[PDB]
Design a protein around this ligand. Structure first.
Ligand SMILES: [Cl-]
Ligand SMILES: [Cl-]
Ligand SMILES: [Cl-]
Ligand SMILES: [Cl-]
Ligand SMILES: [Cl-]
Ligand code: NA
Length: 129
């Protein structure tokens, strides 16, 4: 499913991402934009052989099991396929664990490079929330 901007903002808020670990809703929507273009079904292979899955491009090296990432962990205790659902619950739950890991949203390279320090509020402007 390809979410609308305000539609995703709303779903993220319902699942408790707004101001989660101090990251306003705009930061999350911005990350999703650059990670997946709001496409739940986005996948991308990393150089190291791991793969990134879903609207927030969660990496199989640490966070989910895909059965083909040597030496990896599954710290969210889920099959990576669950992260491709049109239901974002799994993705949000896993993101909460990631962003709590020590480095905050810097875990997402695209957030660091593209969202951090910018006018992230623009991402939720005009949304009924
Ligand atoms: Cl957009
Ligand atoms: Cl915001
Ligand atoms: Cl594996
Ligand atoms: Cl599994
Ligand atoms: Cl980047
Ligand atoms: Na894994």
């Amino acid at each position: 499913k390809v979410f609308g901007r305000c539609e995703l903002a709303a779903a993220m808020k319902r699942h408790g991402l707004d101001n989660y670990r101090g990251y306003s809703l705009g930061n999350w929507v911005c990350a999703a934009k650059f990670e997946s273009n709001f496409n739940t079904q986005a996948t991308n292979r990393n150089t190291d052989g791991s793969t990134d899955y879903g609207i927030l491009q969660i990496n199989s090296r640490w966070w989910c099991n895909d059965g083909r990432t040597p030496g990896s962990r599954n710290l969210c205790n889920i099959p990576c396929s669950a992260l491709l659902s049109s239901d974002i619950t799994a993705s949000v739950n896993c993101a909460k664990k990631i962003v709590s890991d020590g480095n905050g949203m810097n875990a997402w390279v695209a957030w660091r490079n593209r969202c951090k320090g910018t006018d992230v509020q623009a991402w939720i402007r005009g949304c009924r929330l």
